[PDB]
A paper describes a structure:
The zinc-uptake protein ZnuD is expressed under zinc-limiting conditions and was originally discovered in Neisseria meningitidis, where its expression is under the control of a zinc-sensing transcriptional factor, Zur14. ZnuD is an 82 kDa outer-membrane protein predicted to be a member of the TonB-dependent receptor (TbdR) family, requiring the mechanical energy derived from the TonB/ExbB/ExbD inner-membrane complex to couple nutrient uptake to the proton gradient across the inner-membrane. Characteristic of other TbdR family members, ZnuD consists of an amino-terminal plug domain (residues 1 to 147) obstructing the lumen of its own carboxy-terminal pore-forming domain (residues 148 to 734). Combined with molecular dynamic (MD) simulations, our structural findings suggest that ZnuD acquires free zinc ions using a series of binding sites that move zinc across the outer-membrane through a transient pore that requires TonB activation.
Residue numbers in the entry: 18 to 286, 298 to 734
Write the structure that this text describes.
């Protein structure tokens, strides 16, 4: 048969949808952003060997959506690229990269791509021969990676299946070229282990089943100076701190009139290796039967509880505690067709209790994110109408968000007394309404043309609302904005796809217009003495809002002169611009007049550089499958406020695989050679733009299906 996406109960399908095989992924880098890097329109936001996030059409974090088998990952990778994404592509069956109204099934504000990682955790069928699974192993030079992985499915009778799976990865600091005196990049080592046990029913009509997962990651933080260890931010008026007084314990309640616009900044005045120790424990239940009750063709439910935490450490000492407890429930049903129009409607409840707190030195109370509770009540659905060779699908999502914070009312009344009226203290409630509409014309099949559009509202996160702390790994001190508005977006894309024996291609053109776009506004610049002297110095930011305009293009094209050979060209390009920046109050004059200074439109931070790809593939024969990949990464000269130019490199990759069969199972050998040119690889779209990536690496690996 053929690859079919699972993310939607109702199968929608644009021509830019892309399904990556798990078989392909067993030979790919472990972290999601690395694994996906190289797919047209996808770059990486790497942060050492420990983490990389996908950057899709210039977007990342809360403007895309990573899914662990239809479920919330529960991690804190939206917070900073510092933090690894809790999915395992090396243990995956499939990674589906989807565009269109399907995104509305899972979130509001996803404008670039839904990335769903599907797993074997809960079997869904029964294994041939009663047992099935695979075993995997690979080594990588200058990495120095050792990766072992395995999984098993066993029938406990006629309609019961147990699944186990696990992976361990060990890697040291990666080698780097010409980053002198240094053979390897310090603090870039990364170790990870995962395990899962599942147990499920069998159908028809479908399945019910549960699974438990457990993951430990331990990895260094590269380029981590301690110089800001003994530093705090002054951002609120001293006077305001003396009078409001609640801003000493709860500084997230500040308003614009509390910000010191004269001389805000850092006042300065744990000798161990920087690293992150992260633990994620997961309990879930999946279910899907094929004729629930009359009028509906399918029913799919999903329950999840996820315990996430991570310590940011120096030696054996913890500097920062990160915590995120997640519970998520979703019910989707697909109605029986009414009249060549089909539909899936669903409801979702999502609760996230999170904090990001410093170790109690204390050094004064400035919580990056105080303990907060966010609840998402979401109603959503998609409907597709079919006029034969033309499909038209619409999507909607209405989610109400309640952000609550547990105050000590208690101390606040007493500490404040009089004279001052206390702020709202109420729960922050907002409601997003989003719609999508998409048209697919299969004219002259197999020839697909999609036109997709959406108007989406993204609810501000508690990080964006209530941050008031220092996060060294991103070189920023984050201040939230308690009354942000919803990010509004108007999104348009046209995709064209062809596959015809000799030629294959996929082309896409997109534009994303915001819409009260939320962005980090640097304040500690061009003001008092605490303002920055250098571009590299730490930024004191407060979240603000403006217009934004992203547009770009991406594509691939392959030609097969012979069933043996395939030649290809790939490419992508993306522009991101901040428009309509708000005017900010400047220095107070000698007459006491503080003027609003206007800031021009400027470039978006860490937008990927253009990239061209050249590709060769050839089976020779039946078993051996050689391949060559030459990427031309161009320099990035469209720079945001404090960014520097990024080169600009030549990525040459060689590969080969040996397919060989026997009793029980299949033997997939592979040999890979990365960065043969040993070039200085820099990713403008990462927080470490000027730190080189892996110099040059040899990989040998085996996978054994059975
Ligand atoms: C199922 C466990 C068996 C795994 C052993 C793999 C065989 C070789 O691996 C040795 C692992 O450790 C070796 C130490 O170095 C790791 C990477 O090697 C670089 C040394 O040149
Ligand atoms: C068949 C080869 C598989 C070898 C990979 C090792 C898999 C072992 O890991 C699974 C067990 O891991 C449980 C989760 O990790 C432990 C985290 O908590 C304890 C601290 O390590
Ligand atoms: C629409 C892609 C296939 C092209 C064949 C023409 C389809 C005939 O109907 C055109 C209406 O299609 C609606 C497409 O969805 C709206 C996209 O733009 C929304 C902007 O408001
Ligand atoms: C709601 C289903 C139909 C989706 C189309 C809604 C409108 C989205 O427009 C798509 C085209 O994008 C640009 C539209 O421009 C009009 C307003 O744009 C400026 C917004 O800042
Ligand atoms: C199928 C291949 C056709 C390309 C599809 C669109 C991909 C875009 O590729 C264009 C890459 O162009 C290189 C851009 O050059 C550097 C960018 O900076 C120039 C601005 O001064
Ligand atoms: Zn962090």
């Amino acid at each position: 048969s053929r690859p079919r996406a699972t993310s939607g109960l109702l199968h929608t399908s644009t021509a830019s949808d892309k399904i990556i095989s798990g078989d392909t992924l067993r030979q790919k880098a472990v972290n999601l952003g690395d694994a996906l890097d190289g797919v047209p329109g996808i770059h990486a936001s790497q942060y050492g060997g420990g983490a990389s996030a996908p950057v899709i059409r210039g977007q990342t974090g809360r403007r895309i959506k990573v899914l662990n088998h239809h479920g919330e990952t529960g991690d804190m990778a939206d917070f900073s690229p510092d933090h690894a994404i809790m999915v395992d592509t090396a243990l995956s069956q499939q990674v589906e990269i989807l565009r269109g109204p399907v995104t509305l099934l899972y979130s509001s504000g996803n404008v670039a791509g839904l990335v769903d990682v599907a797993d074997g955790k809960i079997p869904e069928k029964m294994p041939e021969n009663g047992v099935s699974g695979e075993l995997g192993l690979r080594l990588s030079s200058g990495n120095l990676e050792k990766l072992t992985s395995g999984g098993i499915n066993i029938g406990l009778g006629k309609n019961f299946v147990l699944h186990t799976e696990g992976l361990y990865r060990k890697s040291g600091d990666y080698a780097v070229p010409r980053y002198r005196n240094l053979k390897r990049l310090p603090d870039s080592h990364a170790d990870s282990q995962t395990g899962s046990i599942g147990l499920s029913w069998v159908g028809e009509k479908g399945f019910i089943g549960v699974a438990y997962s457990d993951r430990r990651d331990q990895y260094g933080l590269p380029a981590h100076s301690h110089e800001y260890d003994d530093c705090h931010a002054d951002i609120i008026w001293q006077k305001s701190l003396i009078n409001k007084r609640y801003l000493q314990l709860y500084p997230h309640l500040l308003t614009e009139e509390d910000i010191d616009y004269d001389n805000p900044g850092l006042s300065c005045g744990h000798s161990g290796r920087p690293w992150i120790d992260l633990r994620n424990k997961r309990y879930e239940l999946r279910a899907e039967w094929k004729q629930p009750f009359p009028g509906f063709e399918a029913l799919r439910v999903h329950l999840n509880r996820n315990d996430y935490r991570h310590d940011e450490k120096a030696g054996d000492a913890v500097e920062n505690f990160f915590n995120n407890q997640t519970q998520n429930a979703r019910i989707e049903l697909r109605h029986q067709p009414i009249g060549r129009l089909k539909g899936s409607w669903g409801v979702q409840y999502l609760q996230q209790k999170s904090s990001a707190l410093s170790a109690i030195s204390e050094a004064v109370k400035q919580p990056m994110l105080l303990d907060n509770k966010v609840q998402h009540y979401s109603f959503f659905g998609v409907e597709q109408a079919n006029w034969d060779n033309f499909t038209l699908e619409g999507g909607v999502r209405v989610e109400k968000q309640k952000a609550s914070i547990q105050y000590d009312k208690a101390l606040i009344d007493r500490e404040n007394y009089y004279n001052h009226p206390l702020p709202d203290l109420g729960a922050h409630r907002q409601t997003a309404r989003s719609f999508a509409l998409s048209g697919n014309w299969y004219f002259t099949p197999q020839h697909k043309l999609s036109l997709t559009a959406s108007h989406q509202e993204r609810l501000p996160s508690t990080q964006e609302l209530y941050a008031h702390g220092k996060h060294v790994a991103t070189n920023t001190f984050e201040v939230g904005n308690k009354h942000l508005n919803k990010e509004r977006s108007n999104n348009i894309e046209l995709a064209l796809g062809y596959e015809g024996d000799r030629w294959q291609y996929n082309l896409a053109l997109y534009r994303n217009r915001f819409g009260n776009y939320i962005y980090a506004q640097t304040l500690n610049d061009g003001r008092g003495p605490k303002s920055i002297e250098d571009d590299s110095e730490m930024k004191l930011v407060r979240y603000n809002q403006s217009g934004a305009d992203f547009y770009g293009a991406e594509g691939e094209i392959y030609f097969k002169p012979t069933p043996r050979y395939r030649i290809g060209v790939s490419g992508d390009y993306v522009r991101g611009r901040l428009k309509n920046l708000p005017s900010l109050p400047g220095r107070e004059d000698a007459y006491g007049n503080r003027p609003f200074i206007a800031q021009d439109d400027q470039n978006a931070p860490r937008v990927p550089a253009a990239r061209l790809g050249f590709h060769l593939k050839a089976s020779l024969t039946d078993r051996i499958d050689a391949n060559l990949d030459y990427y031309r990464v161009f320099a990035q000269n469209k720079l945001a406020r404090y960014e520097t130019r990024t080169p600009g490199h030549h990525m040459l990759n060689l590969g080969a695989n040996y397919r060989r069969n026997t009793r029980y199972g299949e033997w997939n050998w592979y040999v890979k050679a990365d960065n043969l040119l040993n070039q200085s690889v820099y990713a403008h779209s990462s927080f470490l733009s000027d730190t080189p990536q892996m110099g040059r690496s040899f990989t040998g690996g085996v996978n054994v299906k059975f």
